[PDB]
Point group: C3
Chain length 129, copies 3
């Protein structure tokens, strides 16, 4: 899977790493992938450059808000549900990020849609299952 993080400027890089590690953990556990299936990016924005509201749900948002986009092979509705709780669990406990400050949007693709190196389609050749 590919986790793309959009966050506001303010964190030190150590804070960024903690965030990335916590989220990695939650992903590995929710989706039962190897600990080294780790593909992550971070873009930092100034206050101009993100607007994130709450669709009337009564969160909660501070400048620590983390927006996460996930590109993923298919997963059961159970796995996703698990992922979100595991994710906010880890971010609160390991990073002190309120669960009010975590937004996730997820996009699915297929086995043919990944090549991890060497122009190889590893899900198709069977180098990965």
């Amino acid at each position: 899977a590919l986790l793309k993080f959009d966050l506001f400027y303010g964190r030190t890089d150590a804070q960024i790493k903690s965030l990335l590690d916590a989220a990695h953990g939650a992903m590995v556990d929710a989706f039962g992938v190897p600990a080294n299936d780790r593909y992550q990016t971070v873009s930092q924005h100034r206050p101009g450059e993100m607007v994130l509201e709450d669709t009337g749900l009564g969160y909660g948002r501070s400048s620590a808000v983390v927006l996460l986009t996930v590109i993923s092979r298919p997963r059961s509705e159970s796995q996703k549900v698990c992922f979100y709780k595991l994710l906010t669990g880890a971010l609160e406990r390991d990073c002190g990020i309120s669960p009010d400050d975590v937004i996730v949007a997820l996009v699915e693709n297929s086995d043919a849609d990944w090549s991890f190196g060497r122009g190889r389609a590893e899900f198709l050749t069977g180098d990965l299952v």
Copy 2:
């Protein structure tokens, strides 16, 4: 929905906000979502960092070019058609952006693929419809 904007450096932040507001309006009207279903990001690029041509269609592109990526729950083909015209309508009238300078690519996901806060899947729990 999630609107990700890629644009070239040049705008003041007030110009950025106008753009974001205009596009928000066009989205709310085309898709009939609440005015506070607002999730938006902006990345600014130098001339190196985007190449956007026109597939031989005879637009029109200036450095004001706006590329928009939309992540969305499913929408009818009618709603999308409406969205694009509403979008360029609003950007021309509210921002003075030529409709030649607006590119949109859209990606669909499902109810299970969103969590707006608290590790909750609101479309699944029924906190949102």
Copy 3:
């Protein structure tokens, strides 16, 4: 199609252009699209801001690592397979980028999901095939 590049700071802009051109070539040839169906973005990251491992496959990664996200109308599994080899072929031969340093994730949408200019849905109106 839309090619979004995530790369680490280090390249000159000329190096960036070569990369973008090589990848454009590989895409045009693999997918049989017109040479002017060219839509590309680049984000540069500091060492903090990307973590890209190898899922135990034994690549190979340097700071020249290129992560590519592709948004695309549907393509045959053959076309994609072709694309990845063509892509690493071109990057090694034209840019000197080890095929160990190239990661691709691809996302599909439909004809209704594109508007290249003027709030027009060109695949739907038939301005493009």
